Amino acid sequence: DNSRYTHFLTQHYDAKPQGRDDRYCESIMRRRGLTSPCKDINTFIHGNKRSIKAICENKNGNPHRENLRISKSSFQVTTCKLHGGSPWPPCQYRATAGFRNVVVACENGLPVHLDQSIFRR
Template identity: 70%
Template sequence: MMMGLGPLLLIFMLGSCLTQPNPAPDDQRYKIFLNQHYDPTPDGHDDRYCEVTMKRRDLTSPCKDINTFIHGTKKKIKAVCEDKNGKPYGEHFRISKSPFQVTICRHHGGSNQPPCKYRATAGSRYIVIACEHGLPVHLDRTFYRP
């Protein structure tokens, strides 16, 4: 009886080692956050930058009304989720202790179908984000702080 279970147990153990676990849901949300809001080295901060980047990131079908790109390192953005560069803001968010360079892309013009036209506003702003398990998963807003 024991002899028959040995090969079966070995096959089960090998099979479980070969299957890749699904990424954690918060890790997926972090990847989506990066696609929508992270651009460490922008090619300008003008209208053309917005139009090209929004299209490249697949945020133009339909045209997204507004989107903000954060120009900082992943490490600095993640630090907003900790006390290093962030502090609690409201019930569910964190606000950065230091400002980030950002480009805000606002859709303008008639249709919300491509081709999308955007106007860019660049500046230094504080960011408000939601975090899960130490990772940013949602950009709530940005603003100037007096």
């Protein structure tokens, strides 16, 4: 059952996004099913998917805290933060682009969870 990996990608992976502005966030959050209810904060990782999967190996990862893994490489990311307000659509978002390593949990060699705490900022 690779469903949690596929769900991780749905919630947290967008390969080649273009503009990573507020309108990007508002559109991707709708497209990926994160607006009913409005998710408060959600980060998308960009770039090549193999680099994300590799976090689960020694190839691109270190143990982190209790049961997480932190990547050795840095990734382009976009954090979408809800502006206001209501927990139901329409959901307004503010985008913050970044470039840093990421914290995941792995299961069966695949990333199945993103730790959002490092993107609360």
